Amino acid sequence: AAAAAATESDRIAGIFNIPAGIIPTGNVLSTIEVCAHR
Amino acid sequence: DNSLYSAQFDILLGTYCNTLNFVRFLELGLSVACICTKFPELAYVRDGVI
């Protein structure tokens, strides 16, 4: 559905210095970080 | 001499050898429990962190 307006959410994102063209509305899969010290 | 007529002997009947039933790791239950990840170079690793 919509909950708070998606257009309004994207506008609020834009006005507060974030130039996010598309705010994700769904499943997001990021990459786990593996840090090695040699 | 009847001693010229001798036939006592014994023979081998054959033998069988045991083969080892091999285990392929990914085909046991524990396979999905573990994520096995290739990285041969680890001797030069001091301390890794996630």
Tab-separated table of N, CA, C and O in Angstrom:
chain	number	residue	atom	x	y	z
A	1	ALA	N	0.825	-1.202	0.000
A	1	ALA	CA	0.000	0.000	0.000
A	1	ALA	C	0.864	1.258	0.000
A	1	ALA	O	1.909	1.299	-0.648
A	2	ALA	N	0.427	2.283	0.726
A	2	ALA	CA	1.125	3.564	0.672
A	2	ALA	C	1.613	4.059	2.026
A	2	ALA	O	2.744	4.543	2.113
A	3	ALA	N	0.803	3.941	3.077
A	3	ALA	CA	1.103	4.500	4.409
A	3	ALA	C	1.299	6.005	4.231
A	3	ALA	O	0.434	6.657	3.624
A	4	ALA	N	2.378	6.594	4.738
A	4	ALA	CA	2.692	7.975	4.408
A	4	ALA	C	3.023	8.080	2.925
A	4	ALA	O	3.634	7.180	2.343
A	5	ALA	N	2.608	9.189	2.316
A	5	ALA	CA	2.671	9.312	0.865
A	5	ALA	C	4.095	9.120	0.356
A	5	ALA	O	5.042	9.741	0.848
A	6	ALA	N	4.238	8.238	-0.637
A	6	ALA	CA	5.549	7.968	-1.217
A	6	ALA	C	6.118	9.214	-1.881
A	6	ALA	O	7.311	9.508	-1.755
A	7	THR	N	5.273	9.955	-2.600
A	7	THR	CA	5.712	11.217	-3.183
A	7	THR	C	6.125	12.200	-2.097
A	7	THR	O	7.149	12.882	-2.222
A	8	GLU	N	5.343	12.282	-1.019
A	8	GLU	CA	5.703	13.160	0.088
A	8	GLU	C	6.984	12.695	0.765
A	8	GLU	O	7.819	13.516	1.156
A	9	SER	N	7.155	11.381	0.918
A	9	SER	CA	8.385	10.867	1.511
A	9	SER	C	9.593	11.232	0.659
A	9	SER	O	10.629	11.662	1.179
A	10	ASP	N	9.471	11.077	-0.660
A	10	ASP	CA	10.579	11.405	-1.548
A	10	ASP	C	10.857	12.904	-1.547
A	10	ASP	O	12.017	13.325	-1.595
A	11	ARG	N	9.805	13.727	-1.489
A	11	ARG	CA	9.997	15.171	-1.378
A	11	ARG	C	10.716	15.538	-0.087
A	11	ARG	O	11.619	16.383	-0.089
A	12	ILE	N	10.318	14.925	1.026
A	12	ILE	CA	10.965	15.204	2.301
A	12	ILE	C	12.422	14.769	2.258
A	12	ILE	O	13.301	15.431	2.823
A	13	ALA	N	12.704	13.654	1.581
A	13	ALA	CA	14.089	13.241	1.384
A	13	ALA	C	14.857	14.269	0.561
A	13	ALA	O	16.005	14.598	0.877
A	14	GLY	N	14.235	14.786	-0.498
A	14	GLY	CA	14.922	15.732	-1.362
A	14	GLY	C	15.223	17.055	-0.685
A	14	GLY	O	16.331	17.586	-0.808
A	15	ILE	N	14.248	17.603	0.045
A	15	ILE	CA	14.381	18.944	0.605
A	15	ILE	C	15.453	19.016	1.680
A	15	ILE	O	16.030	20.085	1.908
A	16	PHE	N	15.729	17.906	2.361
A	16	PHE	CA	16.677	17.907	3.474
A	16	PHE	C	18.064	17.488	2.983
A	16	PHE	O	18.759	16.676	3.591
A	17	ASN	N	18.458	18.082	1.853
A	17	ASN	CA	19.804	17.990	1.289
A	17	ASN	C	20.132	16.632	0.674
A	17	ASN	O	21.208	16.471	0.087
A	18	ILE	N	19.238	15.653	0.784
A	18	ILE	CA	19.505	14.375	0.106
A	18	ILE	C	18.950	14.423	-1.312
A	18	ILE	O	17.728	14.592	-1.492
A	19	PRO	N	19.778	14.271	-2.351
A	19	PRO	CA	19.257	14.180	-3.726
A	19	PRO	C	18.945	12.743	-4.134
A	19	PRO	O	19.427	12.235	-5.150
A	20	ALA	N	18.121	12.071	-3.330
A	20	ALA	CA	17.723	10.705	-3.638
A	20	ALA	C	16.637	10.700	-4.703
A	20	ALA	O	15.503	11.116	-4.444
A	21	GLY	N	16.981	10.242	-5.907
A	21	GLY	CA	15.996	10.198	-6.976
A	21	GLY	C	14.859	9.237	-6.680
A	21	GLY	O	13.685	9.570	-6.863
A	22	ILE	N	15.191	8.036	-6.211
A	22	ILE	CA	14.193	7.022	-5.893
A	22	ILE	C	14.483	6.504	-4.494
A	22	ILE	O	15.576	5.987	-4.235
A	23	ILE	N	13.516	6.640	-3.594
A	23	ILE	CA	13.609	6.075	-2.253
A	23	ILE	C	13.131	4.625	-2.324
A	23	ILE	O	12.023	4.376	-2.829
A	24	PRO	N	13.942	3.652	-1.910
A	24	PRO	CA	13.524	2.250	-2.034
A	24	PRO	C	12.309	1.953	-1.168
A	24	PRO	O	12.244	2.342	0.001
A	25	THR	N	11.337	1.257	-1.757
A	25	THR	CA	10.132	0.809	-1.056
A	25	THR	C	9.983	-0.680	-1.351
A	25	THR	O	9.249	-1.073	-2.262
A	26	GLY	N	10.672	-1.506	-0.569
A	26	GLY	CA	10.695	-2.935	-0.806
A	26	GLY	C	11.859	-3.628	-0.128
A	26	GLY	O	12.286	-3.223	0.958
A	27	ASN	N	12.384	-4.674	-0.760
A	27	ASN	CA	13.448	-5.481	-0.178
A	27	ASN	C	14.801	-4.945	-0.633
A	27	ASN	O	15.017	-4.718	-1.829
A	28	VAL	N	15.707	-4.738	0.319
A	28	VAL	CA	17.050	-4.232	0.054
A	28	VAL	C	18.048	-5.256	0.583
A	28	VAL	O	17.979	-5.655	1.752
A	29	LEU	N	18.977	-5.683	-0.272
A	29	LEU	CA	20.001	-6.660	0.093
A	29	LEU	C	21.382	-6.029	-0.086
A	29	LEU	O	21.863	-5.886	-1.215
A	30	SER	N	22.015	-5.657	1.023
A	30	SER	CA	23.363	-5.110	0.987
A	30	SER	C	24.395	-6.222	1.178
A	30	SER	O	24.059	-7.394	1.352
A	31	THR	N	25.672	-5.836	1.138
A	31	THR	CA	26.787	-6.780	1.188
A	31	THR	C	27.441	-6.732	2.568
A	31	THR	O	27.832	-5.659	3.039
A	32	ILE	N	27.570	-7.900	3.209
A	32	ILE	CA	28.286	-7.980	4.478
A	32	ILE	C	29.742	-7.613	4.231
A	32	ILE	O	30.283	-7.849	3.143
A	33	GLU	N	30.387	-7.029	5.234
A	33	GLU	CA	31.768	-6.585	5.111
A	33	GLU	C	32.705	-7.575	5.792
A	33	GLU	O	32.514	-7.912	6.966
A	34	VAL	N	33.713	-8.036	5.053
A	34	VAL	CA	34.779	-8.879	5.581
A	34	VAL	C	36.060	-8.063	5.576
A	34	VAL	O	36.531	-7.648	4.511
A	35	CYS	N	36.624	-7.836	6.756
A	35	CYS	CA	37.807	-7.001	6.900
A	35	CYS	C	38.993	-7.875	7.284
A	35	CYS	O	38.955	-8.565	8.309
A	36	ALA	N	40.063	-7.813	6.486
A	36	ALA	CA	41.266	-8.634	6.765
A	36	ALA	C	42.425	-7.740	7.212
A	36	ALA	O	42.597	-6.645	6.634
A	37	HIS	N	43.196	-8.192	8.206
A	37	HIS	CA	44.383	-7.420	8.667
A	37	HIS	C	45.633	-8.290	8.509
A	37	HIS	O	45.724	-9.364	9.146
A	38	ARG	N	46.568	-7.834	7.671
A	38	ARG	CA	47.803	-8.605	7.374
A	38	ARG	C	49.029	-7.784	7.809
A	38	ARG	O	50.122	-8.066	7.271
B	1	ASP	N	58.910	-98.097	-4.925
B	1	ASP	CA	58.400	-97.744	-3.610
B	1	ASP	C	57.093	-96.990	-3.766
B	1	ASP	O	56.980	-96.104	-4.619
B	2	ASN	N	56.110	-97.333	-2.932
B	2	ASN	CA	54.884	-96.550	-2.906
B	2	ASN	C	55.123	-95.130	-2.417
B	2	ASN	O	54.286	-94.256	-2.667
B	3	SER	N	56.251	-94.876	-1.747
B	3	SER	CA	56.618	-93.513	-1.386
B	3	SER	C	56.801	-92.629	-2.606
B	3	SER	O	56.719	-91.403	-2.489
B	4	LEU	N	57.036	-93.223	-3.774
B	4	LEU	CA	57.057	-92.457	-5.009
B	4	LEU	C	55.697	-91.863	-5.326
B	4	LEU	O	55.599	-91.002	-6.207
B	5	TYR	N	54.653	-92.307	-4.640
B	5	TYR	CA	53.276	-91.930	-4.930
B	5	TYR	C	52.750	-91.115	-3.753
B	5	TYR	O	52.146	-91.662	-2.827
B	6	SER	N	52.984	-89.807	-3.793
B	6	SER	CA	52.558	-88.910	-2.731
B	6	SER	C	51.836	-87.723	-3.345
B	6	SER	O	52.217	-87.231	-4.409
B	7	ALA	N	50.780	-87.269	-2.669
B	7	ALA	CA	49.998	-86.173	-3.227
B	7	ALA	C	49.500	-85.165	-2.199
B	7	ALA	O	48.654	-84.335	-2.551
B	8	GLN	N	49.972	-85.190	-0.956
B	8	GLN	CA	49.463	-84.258	0.042
B	8	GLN	C	49.878	-82.842	-0.328
B	8	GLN	O	51.046	-82.591	-0.641
B	9	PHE	N	48.923	-81.918	-0.289
B	9	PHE	CA	49.184	-80.530	-0.630
B	9	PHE	C	48.043	-79.674	-0.106
B	9	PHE	O	46.980	-80.185	0.257
B	10	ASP	N	48.276	-78.366	-0.071
B	10	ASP	CA	47.257	-77.396	0.297
B	10	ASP	C	47.300	-76.234	-0.681
B	10	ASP	O	48.358	-75.914	-1.229
B	11	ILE	N	46.146	-75.611	-0.909
B	11	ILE	CA	46.029	-74.528	-1.872
B	11	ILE	C	45.324	-73.346	-1.226
B	11	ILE	O	44.557	-73.498	-0.270
B	12	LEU	N	45.603	-72.156	-1.751
B	12	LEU	CA	44.927	-70.948	-1.311
B	12	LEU	C	43.574	-70.830	-1.992
B	12	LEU	O	43.428	-71.133	-3.179
B	13	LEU	N	42.580	-70.390	-1.231
B	13	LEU	CA	41.209	-70.354	-1.714
B	13	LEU	C	40.785	-68.987	-2.225
B	13	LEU	O	39.658	-68.847	-2.710
B	14	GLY	N	41.647	-67.982	-2.134
B	14	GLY	CA	41.284	-66.649	-2.567
B	14	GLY	C	40.947	-65.755	-1.395
B	14	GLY	O	40.549	-66.242	-0.333
B	15	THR	N	41.110	-64.447	-1.566
B	15	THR	CA	40.839	-63.487	-0.510
B	15	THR	C	40.171	-62.261	-1.116
B	15	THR	O	40.337	-61.956	-2.299
B	16	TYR	N	39.404	-61.562	-0.287
B	16	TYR	CA	38.716	-60.348	-0.694
B	16	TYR	C	39.276	-59.176	0.095
B	16	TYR	O	39.712	-59.329	1.239
B	17	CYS	N	39.270	-58.004	-0.531
B	17	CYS	CA	39.778	-56.791	0.085
B	17	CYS	C	38.624	-55.836	0.333
B	17	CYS	O	37.622	-55.837	-0.383
B	18	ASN	N	38.784	-55.009	1.356
B	18	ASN	CA	37.759	-54.066	1.766
B	18	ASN	C	38.010	-52.718	1.112
B	18	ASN	O	39.122	-52.185	1.170
B	19	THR	N	36.980	-52.179	0.471
B	19	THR	CA	37.042	-50.835	-0.079
B	19	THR	C	36.501	-49.859	0.953
B	19	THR	O	35.609	-50.201	1.734
B	20	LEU	N	37.066	-48.658	0.979
B	20	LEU	CA	36.622	-47.642	1.922
B	20	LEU	C	35.457	-46.867	1.321
B	20	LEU	O	35.568	-46.324	0.218
B	21	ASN	N	34.340	-46.821	2.041
B	21	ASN	CA	33.192	-46.040	1.598
B	21	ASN	C	33.509	-44.564	1.769
B	21	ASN	O	33.572	-44.057	2.893
B	22	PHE	N	33.714	-43.876	0.655
B	22	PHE	CA	34.148	-42.493	0.706
B	22	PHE	C	33.032	-41.601	1.217
B	22	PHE	O	31.846	-41.917	1.097
B	23	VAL	N	33.420	-40.477	1.802
B	23	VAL	CA	32.477	-39.480	2.280
B	23	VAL	C	32.681	-38.205	1.479
B	23	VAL	O	33.788	-37.655	1.429
B	24	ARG	N	31.625	-37.762	0.814
B	24	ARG	CA	31.624	-36.480	0.133
B	24	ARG	C	30.907	-35.480	1.027
B	24	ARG	O	29.744	-35.685	1.390
B	25	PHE	N	31.610	-34.405	1.376
B	25	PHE	CA	31.177	-33.552	2.473
B	25	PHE	C	29.797	-32.962	2.231
B	25	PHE	O	28.934	-33.008	3.113
B	26	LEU	N	29.565	-32.416	1.041
B	26	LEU	CA	28.348	-31.651	0.812
B	26	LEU	C	27.099	-32.520	0.825
B	26	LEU	O	25.988	-31.985	0.851
B	27	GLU	N	27.249	-33.833	0.807
B	27	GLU	CA	26.116	-34.743	0.762
B	27	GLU	C	25.764	-35.322	2.120
B	27	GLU	O	24.970	-36.265	2.190
B	28	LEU	N	26.334	-34.789	3.190
B	28	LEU	CA	25.891	-35.119	4.531
B	28	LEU	C	24.948	-34.035	5.042
B	28	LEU	O	24.812	-32.964	4.449
B	29	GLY	N	24.291	-34.327	6.165
B	29	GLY	CA	23.344	-33.376	6.716
B	29	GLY	C	23.973	-32.044	7.065
B	29	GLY	O	23.397	-30.990	6.788
B	30	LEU	N	25.172	-32.066	7.638
B	30	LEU	CA	25.821	-30.849	8.102
B	30	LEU	C	26.161	-29.881	6.984
B	30	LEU	O	26.615	-28.769	7.276
B	31	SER	N	25.956	-30.262	5.724
B	31	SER	CA	26.394	-29.419	4.619
B	31	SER	C	25.707	-28.063	4.655
B	31	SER	O	26.368	-27.021	4.645
B	32	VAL	N	24.377	-28.057	4.713
B	32	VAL	CA	23.661	-26.790	4.701
B	32	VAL	C	23.909	-25.996	5.972
B	32	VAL	O	23.870	-24.761	5.941
B	33	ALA	N	24.185	-26.669	7.087
B	33	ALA	CA	24.473	-25.946	8.316
B	33	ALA	C	25.727	-25.100	8.182
B	33	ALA	O	25.870	-24.085	8.873
B	34	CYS	N	26.636	-25.484	7.295
B	34	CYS	CA	27.918	-24.818	7.170
B	34	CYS	C	28.063	-24.207	5.787
B	34	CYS	O	27.814	-24.854	4.768
B	35	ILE	N	28.473	-22.951	5.758
B	35	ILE	CA	28.821	-22.289	4.513
B	35	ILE	C	30.337	-22.356	4.372
B	35	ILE	O	31.082	-21.609	5.019
B	36	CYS	N	30.788	-23.294	3.546
B	36	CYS	CA	32.206	-23.522	3.314
B	36	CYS	C	32.658	-22.632	2.168
B	36	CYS	O	32.139	-22.737	1.052
B	37	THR	N	33.624	-21.765	2.440
B	37	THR	CA	34.007	-20.716	1.513
B	37	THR	C	35.480	-20.833	1.166
B	37	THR	O	36.336	-20.866	2.054
B	38	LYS	N	35.765	-20.855	-0.133
B	38	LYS	CA	37.132	-21.004	-0.608
B	38	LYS	C	37.947	-19.752	-0.314
B	38	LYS	O	37.504	-18.631	-0.581
B	39	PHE	N	39.126	-19.945	0.281
B	39	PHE	CA	40.131	-18.891	0.323
B	39	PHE	C	41.481	-19.481	0.710
B	39	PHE	O	41.879	-19.403	1.880
B	40	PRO	N	42.205	-20.084	-0.238
B	40	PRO	CA	43.459	-20.768	0.119
B	40	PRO	C	44.439	-19.909	0.892
B	40	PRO	O	45.073	-20.398	1.834
B	41	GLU	N	44.579	-18.638	0.533
B	41	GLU	CA	45.562	-17.775	1.180
B	41	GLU	C	45.054	-17.379	2.560
B	41	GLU	O	44.229	-16.479	2.726
B	42	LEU	N	45.554	-18.082	3.575
B	42	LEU	CA	45.258	-17.733	4.955
B	42	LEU	C	46.462	-17.775	5.879
B	42	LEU	O	46.363	-17.274	7.004
B	43	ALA	N	47.585	-18.348	5.455
B	43	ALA	CA	48.760	-18.378	6.310
B	43	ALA	C	49.304	-16.991	6.603
B	43	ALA	O	49.819	-16.765	7.702
B	44	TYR	N	49.189	-16.060	5.664
B	44	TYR	CA	49.685	-14.708	5.849
B	44	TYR	C	48.657	-13.813	6.523
B	44	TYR	O	48.852	-12.595	6.592
B	45	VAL	N	47.569	-14.391	7.019
B	45	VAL	CA	46.517	-13.651	7.702
B	45	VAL	C	46.817	-13.660	9.190
B	45	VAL	O	46.912	-14.728	9.806
B	46	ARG	N	46.960	-12.472	9.774
B	46	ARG	CA	47.136	-12.389	11.217
B	46	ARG	C	45.794	-12.487	11.930
B	46	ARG	O	45.519	-13.471	12.623
B	47	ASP	N	44.920	-11.502	11.714
B	47	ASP	CA	43.677	-11.373	12.476
B	47	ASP	C	42.622	-10.760	11.557
B	47	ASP	O	42.744	-9.597	11.165
B	48	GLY	N	41.602	-11.545	11.216
B	48	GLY	CA	40.478	-11.037	10.458
B	48	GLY	C	39.287	-10.710	11.340
B	48	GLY	O	39.068	-11.306	12.394
B	49	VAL	N	38.501	-9.732	10.890
B	49	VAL	CA	37.342	-9.261	11.644
B	49	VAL	C	36.195	-9.047	10.666
B	49	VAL	O	36.410	-8.749	9.491
B	50	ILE	N	34.965	-9.206	11.157
B	50	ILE	CA	33.760	-9.092	10.345
B	50	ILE	C	32.970	-7.866	10.790
B	50	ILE	O	33.133	-7.371	11.908
